[PDB]
């Protein structure tokens, strides 16, 4: 009846074909609602490859909805596809890996959004762990990527209820631009039980290097 138009893409270093799951989903897809599917796969992710391909499939056929699949966890990717979403207005979502990985605050125009979760909420999950074994956390630092300012507020919001007896010791930012040392000397000042990290794995790599020198790696941190 409706005969909707939909597209899905599987990108991967782990073996499966979209065809496999294509026919599967259409079978499973079949009874509930009408759907027309075009499946395509691409091997490695690029801003140019993804943008070009998605525009290439979408324009040729008037698809209304798609999803995204990947065997990679790259951080930037989500934002890129999100950018496409702001202009297109075509619903997008993703089921695995990086697309599923969280992203910065969604724009006023609706974008693709399956990976994102309230970082605040995520922190409250972590807090539950902190509630069980963590009090007076060593540090919360807005080091890199989205929400440096945003993460900062929630800690305050969590602390603001004042239902229990919460408190903070370390509260700074920064990394790469100058000597790591201005942040490091400040970090030396804090003396607490649990380090809180809000930085990318790349930054973190360096941070790991920082912590060993710092002594954060040692017990009680």
């Amino acid at each position: 009846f409706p005969v909707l138009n939909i597209a899905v893409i599987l990108g991967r270093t782990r073996y499966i074909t979209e065809r496999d799951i294509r026919s599967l989903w259409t079978r499973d897809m079949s009874l509930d609602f009408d759907v027309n599917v075009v499946t395509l796969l691409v091997q490695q992710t690029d801003p140019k490859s993804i943008i070009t391909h998605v525009c290439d499939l979408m324009s040729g056929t008037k698809i209304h909805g798609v999803v995204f699949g990947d065997d990679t966890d790259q951080e930037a990717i989500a934002q890129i596809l999100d950018f496409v979403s702001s202009q297109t207005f075509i619903p997008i979502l993703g089921i695995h890996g990086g697309s599923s990985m969280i992203m910065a605050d969604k724009d006023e125009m609706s974008t693709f959004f399956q990976f994102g979760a309230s970082i605040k909420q995520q922190a409250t999950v972590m807090l539950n762990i902190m509630e069980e074994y963590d009090w007076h956390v060593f540090s919360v630092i807005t080091s890199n990527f989205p929400g440096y300012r945003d993460f900062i507020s929630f800690i305050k919001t969590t602390v603001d209820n004042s239902f229990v007896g919460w408190e903070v010791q370390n509260y700074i930012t920064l990394d790469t631009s100058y000597t790591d040392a201005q942040t490091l000397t400040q970090l030396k000042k804090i003396h607490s039980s649990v380090i809180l990290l809000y930085c990318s794995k790349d930054e973190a790599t360096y941070i790991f290097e920082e912590a060993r020198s710092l002594g954060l790696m040692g017990y009680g941190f």
């Binding site: 909707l4 324009s59 207005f89």
Partner: protein
């Protein structure tokens, strides 16, 4: 779609994506993409944030 299309709404095609700056023939009227954010599927509570 059953909650939009079936319920008095038009689900418009993407139409224009790779050329000029014509505002994509404006925004789709009554697109209703975000009307439902807390749904289920197969009975699974897949309500969204």
């Amino acid at each position: 779609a059953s909650a939009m299309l079936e319920k008095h709404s038009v689900i418009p095609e993407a139409k224009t994506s790779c050329y000029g700056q014509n505002e994509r023939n404006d925004p789709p009227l009554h697109t209703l993409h975000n009307f439902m954010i807390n749904v289920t599927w197969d009975g699974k509570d897949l309500s969204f944030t």
